[PDB]
Design a protein around this ligand. Sequence first.
Ligand code: DM5
Ligand code: DM5
Length: 578
Amino acid sequence: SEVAHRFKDLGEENFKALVLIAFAQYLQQCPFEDHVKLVNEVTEFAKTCVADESAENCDKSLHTLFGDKLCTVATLRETYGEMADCCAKQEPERNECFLQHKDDNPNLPRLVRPEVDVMCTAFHDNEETFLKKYLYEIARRHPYFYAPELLFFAKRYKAAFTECCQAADKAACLLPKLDELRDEGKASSAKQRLKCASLQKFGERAFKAWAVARLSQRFPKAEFAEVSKLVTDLTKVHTECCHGDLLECADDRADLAKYICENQDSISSKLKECCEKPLLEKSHCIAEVENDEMPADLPSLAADFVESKDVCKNYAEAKDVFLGMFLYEYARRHPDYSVVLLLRLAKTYETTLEKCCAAADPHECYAKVFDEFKPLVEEPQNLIKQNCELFEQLGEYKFQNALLVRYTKKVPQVSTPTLVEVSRNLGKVGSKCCKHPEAKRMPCAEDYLSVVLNQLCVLHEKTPVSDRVTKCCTESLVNRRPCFSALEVDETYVPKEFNAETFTFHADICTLSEKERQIKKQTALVELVKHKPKATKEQLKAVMDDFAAFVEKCCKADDKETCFAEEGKKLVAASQAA
Ligand SMILES: CC(=O)[C@]1(O)Cc2c(O)c3c(c(O)c2[C@@H](O[C@H]2C[C@H](N)[C@H](O)[C@H](C)O2)C1)C(=O)c1ccccc1C3=O
Ligand SMILES: CC(=O)[C@]1(O)Cc2c(O)c3c(c(O)c2[C@@H](O[C@H]2C[C@H](N)[C@H](O)[C@H](C)O2)C1)C(=O)c1ccccc1C3=O
């Protein structure tokens, strides 16, 4: 019995919370109330199997039980449309159907907080129901959210309200925390979307390589066999979470934090204080722990991998394990390299072996590989350098605006809200990474951009419109950033039809937050580029500046919405005459 096994390895609180997430990530259109009853019904049954592992259906698979429980409310095609299809299937076909129906952008209501005095009251009234809804609303909007990590997020939300609802100035305590958890949450969701994308689109091998490179960078004093062991365990964890095996994922992940903290002396010195924290807090700290000092007593790759005469032997002997050792050794010595770069080098190395180890004289043939590594390394370095400079002169907002015009020109068929959001999240690389020195920039930036671009890939995957996006998003996982970077302004693209319904603003814009008002003006910028690309450049900054003054003025115009109309028509007229 697994339902019993999982119930007692996790405890009732996390068991009930993980079934709720699992249900909310599969049926994202179901109301909270419906999900709760289903979870509680399962939770009852789970306790039946704990008391007697030999009872009724206690020996069924987790997915059969949860799937049967889910399809009690799902088979209603009236409300959920083409998801009653999945409930007609049996396991494991049902679960695969559920996985392929996860929606990365459902038509769900915007989530706007009520007042602080309203929020704090509700938290105190029913605490558990309050937090269940948190899990509910994030999981239905983020169907790939790292589930065990979401439990940690609910814990921190629980703390914030418990603290700030009994503060002198409740709002001043609460809002910074709620904002910090919101942003930190999205970051977590995005990273995990990339992890799941690798597993499902590119396979186990692709993820394992990523895991080797990252863990080796982080545990460079750890022996190869240790990193490899950790890799296997980390890979099983995310394979389960991306495959909807949330309970097994959470259980195996708790086990992994356990192994690490026990064998701390053979992994990393930066793990003390992490292994002293409680369950969720410990697992969270380890995953994003600081990189360890690399051993100052360390030889050169060139000897073992390109100067040895036994490379071609050691390679063909164990192809993946040999390439693993190379990546490990190369990554361990380079926390200043992005994970993707390190993987590009491993492939470059792999391809030059495939060629030379079959050549007549293998040794002379691959005696130049590190010369291939050179432009691979310098290209991102310059990109990070060039973009960081641009960031300093523009600032976050104007920096996004540039990338927004840059990416609208690369891939103009892509929907506007997707262009606005992705360009923004891209532009946030400037604040996030440009503070660091060159020794910490490439990993911070390029791996971040890879995360953001994966969102582009999956928000576009749903309803494809651009060949170039589809292309970059399929041809590799590792070359995505330079593929998108290499894109030039689409010259085959035919300028969109002009419109009046997409440029004239309303007085409600004065009631929105600074973030929303930015998105409004940025949305209109995307459209404008989609309409008039060609040589358009600083004329845009001229039209963009005319927005701000127009909005600033007309919001303080004591208008009857006419200020937004009279210059609303005046803006367009001056724009046309170019
Ligand atoms: C009806 C009910 O069960 C509760 O809805 C749940 C709830 C909640 O879970 C959260 C919130 C709520 O305001 C409410 C309440 O709704 C509103 C509407 C009710 N009719 C009533 O006005 C009540 C005071 O607040 C009450 C939040 O504001 C919230 C904010 C940030 C993270 C999680 C959250 C978060 O999780
Ligand atoms: C009854 C119900 O199910 C509630 O859905 C739960 C809920 C919630 O779970 C969250 C939130 C809610 O506002 C609400 C409630 O707001 C409702 C009622 C409020 N009075 C207000 O009208 C809001 C716009 O809708 C609706 C959040 O705002 C929220 C913000 C940030 C992270 C998580 C959250 C978050 O999780």
